Amino acid sequence: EFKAGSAKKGATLFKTRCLQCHTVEKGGPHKVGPNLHGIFGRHSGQAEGYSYTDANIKKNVLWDENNMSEYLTNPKKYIPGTKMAFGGLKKEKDRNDLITYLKKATE
Template sequence: MGFEEGDAKKGANLFKTRCAQCHTIEEGGPHKVGPNLHGVVGRQSGKAAGYNYSEANIKKDVLWNEQNLWEYLENPKKYIPGTKMAFAGLKKAKDRDNLVTYMKEASQ
């Protein structure tokens, strides 16, 4: 099982309710508790300029794409042990499909 193109509108609602308290996604948006996610698809983990990442996130050295974001968002602490991201994850595959679809579209 893996990422399948989802509904960006539903993903936007998920972002607003589950992510926006810690992240922005618009170009030039500020870092909050978590980094700004604009351009996250295609970016190396731990590389957003001006954000103080955990050592675990930097050392993971993954190039974010739809599939590995989908896997990460199921259980961030399992995917990157030692991450400071407190989010427990989205267990439903369809929710992750929708969220990753939105993040990809919103961050280009």
């Protein structure tokens, strides 16, 4: 579960752990993973022009800071069968920092 962290640290975590597959900007393209602009408050599997797995659409999670933290702890345990091949951020502070950044950077 989420507590406010450091967006500055979260930016560095994004650059090293997520940027490979994702962009955050309004104008950012889908890559291996979908662009994440507007992710919070949208249901999973809803970015236009991206081909999601059945598993991601089926989860139908309304993304918020708390379920994002559970997801990022271990994506495959939260959405078994997702094609996001990322083992997770096991340190709670890392998830808090990353999500603090993501809440701002995807607006």
